[PDB]
Swiss-Prot record, chain B:
Belongs to the protein kinase superfamily. Ser/Thr protein kinase family. The chain holds residues 363 to 387 of 805 of the full protein. It comes from Drosophila melanogaster. Expressed in all imaginal disks, higher level in wing disk. This is Serine/threonine-protein kinase fused. The gene is fu. Probable serine/threonine-protein kinase; maternally required for correct patterning in the posterior part of each embryonic metamere. May be involved in control of cell division during metamorphosis and ovarian development. May interact with costal-2. Transmembrane segments: none annotated.
Amino acid sequence: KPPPGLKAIIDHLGQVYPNQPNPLQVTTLLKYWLGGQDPLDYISMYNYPGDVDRNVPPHWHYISFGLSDLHGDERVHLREEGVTRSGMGFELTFRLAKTEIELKQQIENPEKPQRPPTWPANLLQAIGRYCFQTGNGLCFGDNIPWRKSLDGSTTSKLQNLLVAQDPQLGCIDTPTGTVDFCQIVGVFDDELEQASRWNGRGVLNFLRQDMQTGGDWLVTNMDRQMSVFELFPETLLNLQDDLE
Amino acid sequence: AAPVINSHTCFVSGNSNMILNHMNDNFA
């Protein structure tokens, strides 16, 4: 019988992606529970073709395994009586917009299926370490003041993260406890500033309103040039301190 | 003379503790 937490997540992903039964995974060699430094055992990578009505562009969808209790035997996560969460109670997801270069390949260019970028696996491992080392889990609406380009590029204006509920995956119960899917969203400095000083959910709601800022499913585009407040200056009206 | 076919070797995006495989390589 398979590891019960891992199996629940795989089963959930099978329902959501019935036509991708065997995705690529980034797999760790020395597992964290054997003394490795990378807390995620696996990161699945899926292609999502998009959805016109919901303003979802084609993108790569990443899902981590290891922040929740994959195994049930305390090899990583101690089980406390009366705790309902599986491990830290969540896994990380990330939605990454295909670049213009990538988009010109898969429709005309020929032989073999295009490989997803693997750099987001480092990003999720690093966020995973941050959560293990501080002991704080992530909640919807949270921000992470990462302060560096998510892809390690010198050019991307996306240096920080907000946390949203994954629109496809949502939250599930498993044999080892509940697992929320916490979708990481790359944001501009001003977006981070306002999520921090005002509110994260309200900033995510702004981002969802247009395709240019992520559409309904909050896809991160590393080449995004303008923040939501630059594109739609009306959103600034919600940010004023009220006196009183 | 100094040539090098020698070629070792970090596996996924700079992380030597990671490899790229298919899900079914990891499970039934």
